[PDB]
Amino acid sequence: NTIRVIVSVDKAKFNPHEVLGIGGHIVYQFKLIPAVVVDVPANAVGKLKKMPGVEKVEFDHQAVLLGKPSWLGGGSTQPAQTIPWGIERVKAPSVWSITDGSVSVIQVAVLDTGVDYDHPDLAANIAWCVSTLRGKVSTKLRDCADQNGHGTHVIGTIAALNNDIGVVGVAPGVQIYSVRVLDARGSGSYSDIAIGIEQAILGPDGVADKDGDGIIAGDPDDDAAEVISMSLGGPADDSYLYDMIIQAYNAGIVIVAASGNEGAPSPSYPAAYPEVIAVGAIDSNDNIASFSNRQPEVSAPGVDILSTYPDDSYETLMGTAMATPHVSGVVALIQAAYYQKYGKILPVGTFDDISKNTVRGILHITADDLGPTGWDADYGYGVVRAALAVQAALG
Ligand SMILES: [Ca+2]
Ligand SMILES: [Ca+2]
Ligand SMILES: [Ca+2]
Ligand SMILES: [Ca+2]
Ligand SMILES: [Ca+2]
Ligand SMILES: [Ca+2]
């Protein structure tokens, strides 16, 4: 009948009328990259490759969520607030005195199964709720709603409200952009993910650099996010998806992704990309989880993590999907504290970075170096520590 494909083209020569001439149609036209999502009969693909302006024709691969209920729970109550062990392990609580992430210019975008926007322990921090499932950007609450629970859990590890109920996130006051890129089963196509990354940049107003001053992330005049957290992965490495990542990276946005739960030699994608921070998972005894894919950039609590769950509930999950938000919450604190002090945010460094002039540089040097001294295939640079990370940033 038809298959979904992503085409990297030359804007000056690619003619959309061409695809419609071969029984295909346009699904989504990227704004930040020279590519377009289209549906064409499985038999017309060979025609696309030869059309003027068509440089590359890539298939629509899949990624999946990396978090599962620890005991098959479906969510339970938490009348009185409690601090999940992973939140203290990342030394977050002592930082709230400096900032809790409630600095207006900061927003963290979580590309996941969506979110339970009415959850009493999350609602106040949900600044934007959107979905990009099936190549279409929807701003309707019914479409952005979490239908799995994963997204609600990941978001709660980052920004669950510090009050009298349930739990509390690493940055309990930071603004959240929930971008649904995974279905009810936790499955997501790369196209919807790339489109999700774009929306995190474009923001609610749909414009990347509204005032055209070259500043996107960290610019109060714009509504772009300064952090993109992806608790998902896949074995495919597509050119267009990577192009979108470079786009978010160049915008000054720190990208964080789960390492993967196959115990593989290296991280899955997009974690595997150098501009993205690959996150491994440790347990309550500081041991690296055996399922945690090797060679990560850093590691964080990822075993038996309690957080928010759909229907104003709470649940314990496990996976590298649970460690990722811990790290994203740490960068949120760093950028928030840095901007509160100086009127700007820190640059997004690289993997090899080891200075206090970069977000990643700071994460690496202040991480709790476990296992063999220095970076290792298990813990990476070590376990992220918000308290030390913020001191080095403001230091
Ligand atoms: Ca709470
Ligand atoms: Ca914008
Ligand atoms: Ca701007
Ligand atoms: Ca500006
Ligand atoms: Ca922002
Ligand atoms: Ca080490």
Side-chain angles (χ1 to χ4, degrees):
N1 180 57
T2 172
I3 61 173
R4 187 145 296 188
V5 181
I6 307 77
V7 199
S8 288
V9 311
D10 167 2
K11 274 48 216 59
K13 300 195 180 183
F14 176 65
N15 182 356
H17 287 277
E18 230 79 348
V19 312
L20 276 102
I22 66 179
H25 59 265
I26 311 300
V27 178
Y28 188 81
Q29 304 183 73
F30 285 95
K31 298 166 180 293
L32 306 189
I33 60 174
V36 57
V37 185
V38 306
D39 285 336
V40 292
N43 42 289
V45 175
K47 293 181 186 177
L48 267 188
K49 292 170 175 292
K50 289 202 176 190
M51 300 180 148
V54 173
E55 310 183 311
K56 187 169 190 177
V57 179
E58 298 182 287
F59 290 140
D60 207 337
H61 303 304
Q62 284 183 59
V64 70
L65 82 190
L66 295 167
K68 299 289 170 55
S70 291
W71 317 298
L72 282 170
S76 27
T77 308
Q78 266 292 322
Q81 178 172 284
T82 322
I83 309 178
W85 73 270
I87 298 300
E88 297 179 316
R89 179 67 187 86
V90 76
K91 312 297 176 185
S94 70
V95 182
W96 302 334
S97 174
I98 297 169
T99 185
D100 64 348
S102 58
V103 281
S104 56
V105 66
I106 306 296
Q107 293 84 32
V108 168
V110 183
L111 281 53
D112 217 292
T113 72
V115 69
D116 177 8
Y117 51 82
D118 298 315
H119 195 122
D121 217 27
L122 294 174
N125 289 331
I126 304 175
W128 193 38
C129 202
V130 287
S131 170
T132 66
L133 294 185
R134 304 181 303 286
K136 62 102 173 177
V137 177
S138 177
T139 183
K140 295 170 179 175
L141 297 175
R142 67 155 180 268
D143 300 321
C144 83
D146 188 5
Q147 297 293 166
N148 174 285
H150 193 267
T152 294
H153 195 285
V154 177
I155 291 169
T157 293
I158 297 173
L161 297 165
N162 184 18
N163 45 29
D164 305 319
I165 66 170
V167 301
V168 52
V170 173
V174 74
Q175 293 162 59
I176 295 288
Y177 278 174
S178 175
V179 187
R180 182 138 102 105
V181 304
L182 304 176
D183 53 47
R185 302 172 195 170
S187 169
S189 55
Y190 274 26
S191 56
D192 295 341
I193 292 172
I195 298 171
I197 298 172
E198 171 151 292
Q199 296 309 306
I201 301 165
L202 301 180
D205 65 20
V207 188
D209 190 1
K210 171 177 299 306
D211 60 359
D213 69 349
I215 310 174
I216 295 177
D219 180 359
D221 301 312
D222 280 307
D223 58 4
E226 5 294 308
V227 179
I228 289 178
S229 193
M230 302 184 271
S231 291
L232 57 287
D237 172 5
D238 300 325
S239 186
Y240 78 97
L241 179 57
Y242 182 53
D243 293 333
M244 184 56 68
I245 283 190
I246 286 177
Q247 223 49 48
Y249 175 81
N250 283 349
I253 302 176
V254 177
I255 317 169
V256 191
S259 190
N261 311 332
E262 304 71 58
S266 63
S268 291
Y269 289 93
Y273 291 126
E275 0 284 343
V276 183
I277 303 171
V279 182
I282 59 163
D283 57 15
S284 60
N285 290 300
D286 263 13
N287 290 134
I288 194 72
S290 55
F291 62 71
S292 186
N293 285 173
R294 267 51 187 178
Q295 302 190 68
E297 193 171 317
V298 291
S299 44
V303 182
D304 299 352
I305 310 301
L306 178 70
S307 187
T308 45
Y309 218 60
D311 291 352
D312 316 337
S313 182
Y314 308 87
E315 192 51 76
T316 303
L317 309 206
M318 54 189 181
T320 47
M322 276 56 40
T324 310
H326 281 92
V327 176
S328 302
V330 172
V331 307
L333 289 177
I334 292 171
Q335 299 289 223
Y338 201 80
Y339 189 97
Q340 170 167 259
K341 193 180 187 295
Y342 313 103
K344 78 284 181 58
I345 63 176
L346 277 162
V348 187
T350 67
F351 177 81
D352 293 297
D353 232 294
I354 55 176
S355 58
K356 317 189 178 188
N357 313 315
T358 266
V359 178
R360 297 165 81 176
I362 290 175
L363 285 171
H364 311 332
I365 64 177
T366 58
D368 194 338
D369 180 18
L370 298 176
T373 300
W375 184 92
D376 57 273
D378 299 307
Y379 299 99
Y381 279 98
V383 180
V384 187
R385 299 142 112 187
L388 286 177
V390 169
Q391 287 304 135
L394 302 181

